[PDB]
Design a protein around this ligand. Structure first.
Ligand SMILES: CC[n+]1c(C)c(C(=O)OC(C)C)c(-c2ccccc2Cl)c(C(=O)O)c1C(=O)O
Ligand SMILES: CC[n+]1c(C)c(C(=O)OC(C)C)c(-c2ccccc2Cl)c(C(=O)O)c1C(=O)O
Ligand SMILES: *Cc1c(COP(=O)(O)O)cnc(C)c1O
Ligand SMILES: *Cc1c(COP(=O)(O)O)cnc(C)c1O
Ligand SMILES: OC[C@H]1O[C@H](O)[C@H](O)[C@@H](O)[C@@H]1O
Ligand SMILES: OC[C@H]1O[C@H](O)[C@H](O)[C@@H](O)[C@@H]1O
Lengths: 812, 812
């Protein structure tokens, strides 16, 4: 009795068995009881929510069963700490991974509703800037699919990356109010709310140190379910929200906004460090709450065993304060000896590096750290002293090495090198692509690689075949399925078997048919939503990624102006029609990035209206590039632009998405491009330009852009056009900053790769002229894209860093 | 087909038929799917939410059916505009009105849960300061119960009235974060979001005037269901929330908080005007959005008919901008002639006055109005000019009358008298108690009553018998029910029939038994929650209401010190044991109110620890008085203190609650006390002190507190104790401001009513000494409390102001 009567309360029976009748029944229940509406007043958005709640209900039993499972079994837990999780939309993904897509599609059909229309109502959960943010998302999906006891931990931003609008040809930022109509996926957990401390001071009492007189900010966690692919595993992504703890009364209540501002906006910087105190607060905020929750879970089914039960993966140095914080907790609060604590910390943390550009790495001024986090600075100084002691003993006499390896950067404004803090406090440091990891070992982290070689590894990036194939390209996924089955969805290497079809006329016809369907669908979408007309029988040339000088959208710009100038030169000469699409967001304070967007639209303004050009060349800027737009444009792409200066793009992931969806690649030997070319065969790739060794040689003697300008007539013509106002009649000097940079301050040597890039593009169009051969080369690409699935990347992280074994065994 | 297939989507079948099996089934469903939890980790709060969602589901069909009904039938609609709705808790109330209380009680029993415990988790929706806010709430309940097509319209405050804490004997304010764990009762309605304009300027174009260059703030509505008593009617309370429309990017996103601050906190002023611009914004905010929604609904099933279809009731002058706003819309936007528009407006609006104190009435400086609402000020000036033209024609030559009646108050700081704007723009003005309405006609609104007698009415206040009897005193409700049935719950006049039992020994025994049960339960609650010990066999003397000088808690203080001094004087003389309880909140900036709370605790500090006093007298301050505490302490009260200075308390409603729950009343002939004494018979009341005419006579010759001090030795002793530090040893002069006010600046003549109050209290204890006679007098009170049910008040408003007929006919 009594407590035995509570056994009734169980998940036991849900919405049935996963079919049309019960689904309709539940959609209906949600529309009336959850949305408090009826068919006469229900809005399209209401229907979207009704469907989303019905689908979400199917996650619950699994979600509860999975967490119960980890509690019972008690496996080692993996914690992915990141300040970004670029999740995109959740509805379709959930349906696909739960195998409910068809049933929901039919149930919504019988209720007279269009599921595709409804899916379009959901907006992106854009809590990320780009690559690094999307990687965390793909990683969450793969860890679930591989049955790992993994937890994603981040910040629940009220405003994700800004929604970009184009006005007058310029980018305009708009707050991304994604939580306006609520979020049907998350579930707040008040009872796990935790306190995070700031400022204050340190007093050294008999016992040890004490952090006193601090300002408190509460951290309320919101859980979002992350379903693996058809294995009945539902993992959790826990995002923290800032809440005030509990000039006059009114102002005091209005001032609660100050403390809650911590989780207000995602800083829109991609590959760029901005030392704003509010960002430092966000970083400490996610770290402090996360570590408390991790230790709680550890204590609930001493610390010697911590590393055998916990793995903390730092996505970049953003959550690096986890190192000194874990030490603070173990030493100050748990009272362990420093060295035993340090052993535990190193064994627990591992650091992932995503870039080699100096301006993209974190170096916090010590004055900012001493006032905001006084005891963390003290602990960092002690970590530094003991680390420097070790290198000094390993390399006696080498004082300059000590200076280079120090966690503290002396100078006008003393700063703390966070990357150095991470290497010292992690048992594994990793690059995200073979070439990148090697560059780390030879340049920026060389001193560290020499002191601790065992620490450095590589983990080439990947993307999830679920969202990036099954989800976004059903057509491609089905034709691949009719030939080889469905086991590839969680074993991408099986795509290899498609090589056996390279000379199969049916498959060759099908690959091309799927592509043109996608091209047609994308063209329809652009005309409907933006009233933009694009020629579907043109080659879709696409460069989508954040706007950057290192990504060289400018090089792409030089090429399209070349294509235009050549056409005007010889109007009646045939050219492979092209629709050149460039999309991506610029960071608010990045002037050159904003000028590049303006140059792109400016070029289009001339190119797109020249009668002699007509249907032959069209240049368009894809506004507001985000995960959901990627899922639309990537599958309709013919040519994938991956032209960063060799040695600058650590890996890239968009490159992999384009390859998986049937596009041929034109790029440099940079990042993962190297490994992708290796996988498909350089003969099936369009690699061009300088190699890393080539830019290094140019650096040794000095890069003189004038040389290339004096030697290339076609290049001179374009700069002359830019400078004279040909692309900006009403404001002739509009692009003088672009021209000046290119001519005298180009760190990314655009002119040095111009000629080879233009020639390589000539060969791309030569191949496109032969559909049969273009398609056969495409098949050889898709068939070798298997190594780039995040399931592979994750399995390596698991076996070589976390010390846990992946698994595709389903739960009941 | 197609659109005929959507007929399936219907409310048709819900959670069954209203019994235990289906209720358990649904509680369970909600716990797993809505809270995403299971019995092993569910917290008590989770269970509370599970139960609340299950109950809420029963509201939906009715809620949808009711609104559909008003749309089909299209009755005249009544709009109750108020800046406060003191709703208290919703769970029990909903269960009671839907007749689900017993079933939920049993279903939660079988699931091993304690419903009472769970109900205690819900916190008050304290969006009100006191009387005026509670009245709107009681009114919402009665309008539903009387089948009126009524809509409550207000602001969804993020923070209601502050939670009061007592520290060191002083009040400490704490933000009331009532939406922290979410609100299971409300349902946001994004699609009805509306724009509200501020600042800007006015330009007079050919056509007419135009309000241009304004700052926009969006208004998002949240609906809360309000169920009538067992008639299947569910009306709506629509509360507006402020949302920003869509120094750098980051700061710009952080600055969205500024516009959303409008709906952040309820100003904690009770009977006091504070001219803060943020308050003016809140007032315009609720008015502008509300009027747009009202006109939308009007247009969707010309303006001549507006008054036949719309009634706008202004709760005080808070939403008075509705008058100039309705004119702005009709003239500027709908292009109607001024006079036809004015006719429509007056016929549509009616104003309710709640006080006569000058400091409690709204007078907005014109500079504040010209910058924030430039065209409203222009319209107010035109309304003034035309109104003054009418009085001038009605009273030729009377220039001083024009000056007194003007909507504009000249002087150092020109201001707009909002009460005057309301009378001019309403077809009915009303006081809230017979004596109050008459005072309006003879003093403050005299000039207006002389120009338009037909306009002035009275509508004596009431309280709802559902929440204030059935809900809070089940014991009393059941014994009354065993004698006369249940029809009284929506026909309170039937309580009259209990007079037939005044000499019935069973009923007499039962009334006293119910009271002592409540006294016992309250004593248990105070010891559990506050570790406060009170003697259950003492007479519970209670004064709960906001702390004010006009309410004279100080007079009550003088009495308890008298009781103490008399006991110390003659220790061995018998006295009726008393537990004097005083509770209520002080406005943050009201110094005297805060000193009074401190004096109360100070007195307790001495009284409660004197060994010779022992169990005989105990003085306690009930911390954080709010609607849910009222429901607990009022039913356990023996003596209800209603001692405001005659002519100051417009009505009062707590007085009525105490009468309905079996407490005898000690008070002045003020507000509704007059009508309550009339109903039960003054012989069954404890009326004392000066009457209105008596304070007026004192005012004519001058109030000299020194006279009373020189003539009353016992009074002199107390002031001497206060002044010397007897109640504040460590800070002797702590209460010098209280003493100084009483001696020389008492606008409320406390000393003038001291002697009569003390004697009247002697007679109260004389009666208490005789339980049988105390109880019989109590019966005569409860039996005549019927006129004070808000159902009566509302029926009068309906028939004499709104022009609509009440109805108890149930819906299916
Ligand atoms: C006690 C063991 N856990 C478990 C079986 C959980 C569960 O049943 O979760 C389901 C409702 C999705 C879960 C959990 C526990 C308490 C409140 C809320 C959650 Cl969410 C967690 C966690 O920290 O999140 C567990 C853990 O490990 O501490
Ligand atoms: C079209 C007629 N109305 C009606 C039958 C309603 C209804 O079915 O509401 C149910 C979901 C609780 C209701 C309504 C209409 C559209 C969206 C949301 C609501 Cl809530 C209202 C309103 O303004 O609130 C109506 C009105 O009058 O305009
Ligand atoms: C995959 C992805 C990225 C990363 O693209 P790269 O070309 O590797 O820089 C950026 N943004 C979005 C929306 C993505 O989907
Ligand atoms: C009824 C009520 C009031 C009004 O009380 P009066 O004594 O009429 O001023 C104030 N506060 C609360 C919580 C109430 O329930
Ligand atoms: O590692 C994930 C991604 O992180 C960053 O955004 C890098 O610029 C990119 O090259 C890398 O692919
Ligand atoms: O009208 C409702 C209430 O409004 C105010 O709070 C008055 O002080 C009170 O007397 C009245 O009862």
């Amino acid at each position: 009795s009594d407590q035995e009567k509570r056994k009734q309360i169980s998940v036991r029976g849900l919405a049935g068995v996963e079919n049309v009748t019960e689904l309709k029944k539940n959609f209906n229940r949600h529309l009336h009881f959850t949305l408090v509406k009826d068919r006469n007043v229900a809005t399209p958005r209401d229907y979207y929510f009704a469907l989303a709640h019905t689908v979400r209900d199917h996650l619950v039993g699994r979600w509860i069963r999975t967490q119960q499972h980890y509690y019972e079994k008690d496996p080692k837990r993996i914690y992915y700490l990141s300040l970004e999780f670029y999740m995109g939309r959740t509805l379709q993904n959930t349906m696909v991974n739960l195998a409910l897509e068809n049933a929901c599609d039919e149930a919504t059909y019988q209720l007279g509703l269009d599921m595709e229309e409804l899916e379009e109502i959901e907006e992106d959960a854009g809590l990320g800037n780009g690559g690094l943010g999307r990687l965390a998302a793909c990683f969450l999906d793969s860890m679930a699919t591989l049955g790992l006891a993994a937890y994603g931990y981040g910040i629940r931003y009220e405003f994700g990356i800004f929604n970009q609008k184009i006005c007058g040809g310029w980018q305009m930022e708009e707050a991304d109010d994604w939580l306006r109509y609520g979020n049907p996926w998350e579930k707040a957990r008040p009872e796990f709310t935790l306190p995070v401390h700031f400022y204050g001071r340190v007093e050294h009492t008999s016992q040890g140190a004490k952090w006193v007189d601090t300002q408190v900010v509460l951290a309320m966690p919101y859980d979002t379910p992350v379903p693996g692919y058809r294995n009945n595993v539902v993992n959790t992504m826990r995002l923290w929200s800032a809440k005030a703890p509990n000039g006059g009364y009114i102002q005091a209540v209005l001032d609660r906004n100050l403390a809650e501002n911590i989780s207000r906006v995602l800083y829109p910087n991609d590959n760029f460090f901005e030392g704003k105190e509010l960002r430092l607060k966000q970083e400490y905020f996610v770290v402090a709450a996360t570590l408390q929750d991790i230790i709680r879970r550890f204590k609930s089914s001493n610390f010697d065993a911590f590393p055998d039960k916990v793995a903390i993966q730092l996505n970049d140095t953003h959550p690096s304060l986890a190192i000194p914080e874990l030490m603070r907790v173990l030493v100050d609060l748990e009272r362990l000896d420093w060295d035993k604590a340090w052993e535990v910390t190193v064994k627990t943390c591992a650091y992932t590096n995503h870039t080699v550009l100096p301006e993209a790495l974190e170096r916090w001024p010590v004055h900012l750290l001493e006032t905001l986090l006084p005891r963390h600075l003290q602990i960092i100084y002690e970590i530094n002293q003991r680390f420097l002691n070790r290198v000094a003993a390993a390399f006696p006499g080498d004082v300059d090495r000590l200076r280079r390896m120090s966690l503290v950067e002396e100078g006008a404004v003393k700063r703390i090198n966070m990357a150095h803090l991470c290497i010292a406090g992690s048992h594994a440091v990793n690059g995200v692509a073979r070439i990148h990891s090697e560059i780390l070992k030879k340049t920026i982290f060389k001193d560290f690689y020499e002191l601790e070689p065992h620490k450095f590894q590589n983990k080439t990036n990947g993307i999830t075949p679920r969202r990036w194939l099954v989800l976004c390209n059903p057509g491609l996924a089905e034709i691949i399925a009719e030939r080889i089955g469905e086991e590839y969805i969680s074993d991408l290497d099986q795509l290899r078997k498609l090589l056996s079809y390279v000379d199969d006329e049916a498959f060759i016809r099908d690959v091309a048919k799927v592509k043109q369907e996608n091209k047609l669908k994308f063209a329809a979408y652009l005309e409907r939503e933006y009233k933009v007309h694009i020629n579907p029988n043109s080659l879709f040339d696409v460069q989508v990624k954040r706007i950057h000088e290192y990504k060289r959208q400018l090089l792409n710009c030089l090429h399209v102006i070349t294509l235009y100038n050549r056409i005007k030169k010889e109007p009646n000469k045939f050219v492979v029609p092209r629709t050149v699409m460039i999309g991506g967001k610029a960071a608010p304070g990045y002037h050159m990035a904003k000028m590049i967007i303006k140059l792109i639209t400016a070029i289009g303004d001339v190119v797109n209206h020249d009668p002699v050009v007509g249907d032959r060349l069209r240049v368009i800027f894809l506004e507001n590039y985000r995960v959901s737009l990627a899922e639309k444009v990537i599958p309709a792409a013919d040519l994938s632009e991956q032209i960063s200066t060799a040695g600058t793009e650590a890996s890239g992931t968009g490159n992999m998405k384009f390859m998986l969806n049937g596009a041929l690649t034109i790029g440099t030997m940079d990042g993962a491009n190297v490994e992708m070319a290796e996988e498909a065969g350089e003969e099936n790739f369009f690699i061009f330009g300088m190699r890393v060794e080539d830019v290094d040689r140019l650096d040794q003697r000095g890069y003189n852009a004038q040389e290339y300008y004096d030697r290339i007539p076609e290049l001179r013509q374009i700069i002359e056009q830019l400078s004279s106002g040909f692309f900006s009649p009403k404001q002739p000097d509009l692009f003088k900053d672009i021209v000046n940079m290119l001519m005298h301050h180009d760190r990314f040597k655009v002119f040095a790769d111009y000629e080879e890039y233009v020639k390589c593009q000539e060969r791309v169009s030569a191949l496109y002229k032969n559909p049969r051969e273009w398609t056969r080369m495409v098949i050889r690409n898709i068939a070798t894209s298997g190594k780039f699935s995040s399931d592979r990347t994750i399995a390596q992280y698991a076996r070589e860093i976390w010390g846990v074994e992946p698994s595709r065994q389903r739960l009941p």
